[PDB]
Symmetry: C3
Subunit: 216 residues, 3 copies
């Protein structure tokens, strides 16, 4: 139902210790990246936000993170979900700490929100008060700055992004041009904390508006 | 049933009246693009043809047009369908006109055609007599030239494209290499309107022959 | 159930006897490529392996080979499956011979293997003892050299690739970064035949290990959160 939180779920977690040189090469790891933390989940944007949080909570970098084509509901296997993330660190301890922070964030109450009665339209409007090393790299903004992470289905996202950009003094840093692998769209916007918040609120309101009147 | 038209459906339409400068930047709009028209639908190629038709009826440009992975039947949300299109124009009135032309075309009787009994194989064989500014650009030909717009599932499309190219005096302008986002394939072919129609007819016949005999290669 | 072979199926096969120049150009064919063989199936990596077998059996090259987004289970049409392959040769006879070998290989008993009770996790751990021209070119090795062709879902594949690389004297030739179109991942590894077999064995064991315990981390390391 409308305004319900869609609960995100982690599906698998594993660790690689003393990563093989052949794999380190293909993943373009740094010399000091000895251990990898692997995670899959059924919600990509929540997991991306969680991985970024992990770079704050632990001595890890996000070295790989990709979404699956057509989304979790179309997964052909049990553990694929719609996202794979890989953290890299100097030791299993740091990688485990990163994965724990990732899990904590995923389970913290964050998630996509339903915009209609049968949850067939959903959106993500998450304000990140200070970016870690992953989302700042991705957005092309300074580490530690705030951002609004805004995602919705393609038309809703374009309409609502326009509403968000007019609601506050924010800049569009990275555009998730539709379709993402999961057939969504969105952007990372940056500005002051209060501006980003204002953008998240306007975005959510605008998605709900389209959902209530798709053909008007 | 074979030869049945598969009706295309529009799912969502909205107008942005005064696009924000930030959005205008990431969409790489031109300064004269003040208003956007957004549309999604459950059939990508019909929509692309419709959008191109809109550029003939109004002063709008197709500034964005993309298909969704795995097609409308696999959409995870209500309004995603399998295509999003964005028209840009100088005013909301002009964008509204372009959207109305787009909608009219989508509901004009064009569409994919079934090749078999349960409609599990379908194809698009549409002759565009006079391209607008969108398809001409993507095909790399002058505006106002004719196209055969040919789409089918991957093998059917490769086989039928060969038949189309042999049936008529046409050239391949743009190859939709399998898979497109929707797991189809095909091409835009150009030539005279009559040659394009002949290519459409041959493509159609060839897709149907594969559907009736999918494993036969001897 | 676990260790069950997943049977691959061919969906469509055709020959273009005399390819048009317009198509030859877009496919970037060689002048001597006069005929095309087309095939679709519901399992991409088995079909790729089969196409490579074709190049050992007849005068054909693999000139096109691509997987479908989100895999065969999400196909929206009857013949799309999850793969299209195109062979090119100098004549219809050679293409027919190539397609024949392709079909035979697909129906030989090769296939993905299930890792759990409901076959919701599967993998491919195929030792190609003698590569044809397609896989050897893909891997950047000489024809006839051995390959381990390893594929599994994304996390399983990353974990199991690391296991495979450590279990034998092999080199990573090609990495299929997750997601491939079908939302899998894997690699082609090369080495001696025995080394490739060891890699295949280690890969299979590692995937089954993840399948049986995908979230062991929670109890071991995530307690008191
Ligand atoms: Na599906």
């Amino acid at each position: 139902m409308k305004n319900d939180l869609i609960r995100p779920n982690v599906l698998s977690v594993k660790i690689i210790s003393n990563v093989s040189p052949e794999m380190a090469k293909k993943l373009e790891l740094e010399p000091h990246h000895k251990s990898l933390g692997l995670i899959t989940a059924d919600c990509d944007d929540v997991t991306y936000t969680a991985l970024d949080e992990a770079t704050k909570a632990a001595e890890v970098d996000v070295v790989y993170a990709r979404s699956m084509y057509a989304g979790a509901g179309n997964a052909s296997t049990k553990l694929a979900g719609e996202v794979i993330g890989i953290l890299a660190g100097p030791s299993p301890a740091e990688v485990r700490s990163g994965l724990n922070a990732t899990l904590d964030f995923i389970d913290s109450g964050v998630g996509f929100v339903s915009a209609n009665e049968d949850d067939s339209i959903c959106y993500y409007a998450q304000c990140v008060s200070r970016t870690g090393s992953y989302l700042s790299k991705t957005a092309g903004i300074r580490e530690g700055e705030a951002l609004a992470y805004l995602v919705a289905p393609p038309l809703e996202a374009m309409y609502a992004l326009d509403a968000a950009l007019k609601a506050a003094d924010v800049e569009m840093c990275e555009f998730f041009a539709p379709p993402t692998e999961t057939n969504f769209a969105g952007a990372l916007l940056t500005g002051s904390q209060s501006a980003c918040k204002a953008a998240c609120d306007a975005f959510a309101e605008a998605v709900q508006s389209v959902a209530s009147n798709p053909l008007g």
